[PDB]
Amino acid sequence: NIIVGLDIGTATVSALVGEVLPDGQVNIIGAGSSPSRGMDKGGVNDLESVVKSVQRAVDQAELMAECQISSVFISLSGKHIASRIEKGMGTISEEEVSQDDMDRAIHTAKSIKIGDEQRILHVIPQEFTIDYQEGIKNPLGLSGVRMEVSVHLISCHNDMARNIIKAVERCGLKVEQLVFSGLASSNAVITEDERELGVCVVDIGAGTMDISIWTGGALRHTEVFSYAGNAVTSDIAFAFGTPLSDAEEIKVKYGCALSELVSKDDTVNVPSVGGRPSRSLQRQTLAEVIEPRYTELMGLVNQTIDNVQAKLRENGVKHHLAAGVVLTGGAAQIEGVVECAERVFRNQVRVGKPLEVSGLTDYVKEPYHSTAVGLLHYARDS
Ligand SMILES: Nc1ncnc2c1ncn2[C@@H]1O[C@H](COP(=O)(O)OP(=O)(O)OP(=O)(O)O)[C@@H](O)[C@H]1O
Ligand SMILES: [Mg+2]
């Protein structure tokens, strides 16, 4: 069957077509990419711009798969993404847990007073409890009288999700499911082995950075900040008086996250606006602009872990990340992220990349594809 994932980002839009296989693997058949215009902080700013930009990437990806695209799996992120842990319970009719006995138990967990500005997009039943038998992941067929569930809720702003959905429908597609950007990137960068000990995946992009914490194989918290790779590009464009279109080229090419990792002999050529000569600038001086901003972006991540570990260690649940912090997304490709993050996070830090991709491994390499390939891992589960 044909499977499609769509990552509408603040900088680039990525579309991926894939095939389902018996063992549970994703054979990617087609890939598409296009720059995104009219998009800020994870949400849209110009609807007509993203409709063309998301049709540009979805048209070159169906050509590269020889099949028309109908249903897609889109991703969305933003500061409105909130995570809630809720508990539900219910009786067990006939002393044998069926599917109805769980939906009624999950229904009680997600029936909360949320409002209307918010809408829930993920409901993740984690651990069940059938009559003093705690720690049960899938209680189908088990015998008992009463069950208890702890369900993880992830909600988002409704109006900021309606704008993203309309851009996909305006192209002639139908959305099958909306996936959180940090949850998809997590589900395609770390392995189940990395989930048992503990991990903290961050998806630093252009508009937003997406945080996900797994301590034991279950999502423990979800938090999103609207400061990312575009807030540091402006820092370059401001401190040196150059356009953002030019300050972005001297960041992708000559960017460094730690000023003590570039020699004093490295010089970069920053242009000038209007038609004036381009003066040479020390790459170390440019790295001295990128470093203080990247450490603040990780201070928000490090203080989020501290507040979550204080709610997990003080609650009788696994709380330590023995595998450290994993950095994915386009902004995690700048020189020195590993050494800049290890200086703020006491734990180890690595940079994740989409793994175990079958075919088309010439465009599914760098970590700015982790979200798009995480939607494929989410659409495989059907
Ligand atoms: N080699 C590089 N060095 C430094 N920064 C880079 C590099 N390559 C890309 N970036 C940064 O990556 C950012 C966008 O990358 P990415 O594809 O992860 O974003 P996105 O998915 O569109 O955004 P979002 O997080 O809003 O979904 C840009 O701000 C750019 O500055
Ligand atoms: Mg992204």
Residue numbers in the entry: 8 to 389
Quote the original article:
During bacterial cell division, filaments of tubulin-like FtsZ form the Z-ring, which is the cytoplasmic scaffold for divisome assembly.
Using X-ray crystallography, we demonstrate that Vibrio maritimus FtsA crystallizes as an equivalent double filament. The lateral interface in the VmFtsA double filament is almost exclusively formed by contacts between IC domains. Both interfaces have local twofold (C2) symmetry as indicated in Figure 1b. Interestingly, the FtsN suppressor mutations E124A27 and I143L16 described for E. coli FtsA also map to subunit interfaces in the VmFtsA double filament structure. To corroborate, we designed a lateral interface mutant of E. coli FtsA based on the VmFtsA double filament structure: EcFtsAM96E, R153D (right). The lipid monolayer assay showed that EcFtsAM96E, R153D was indeed deficient in EcFtsN1-32-dependent double filament formation. However, Cβ-Cβ distances in the VmFtsA double filament structure of 3.7 Å for FtsA3x HA, D123C and 12.6 Å for FtsA3x HA, Q155C indicated that cross-linking with BMOE with an expected cross-linking distance of ~8 Å might be inefficient, which prompted us to try thiol-directed cross-linkers of different lengths.
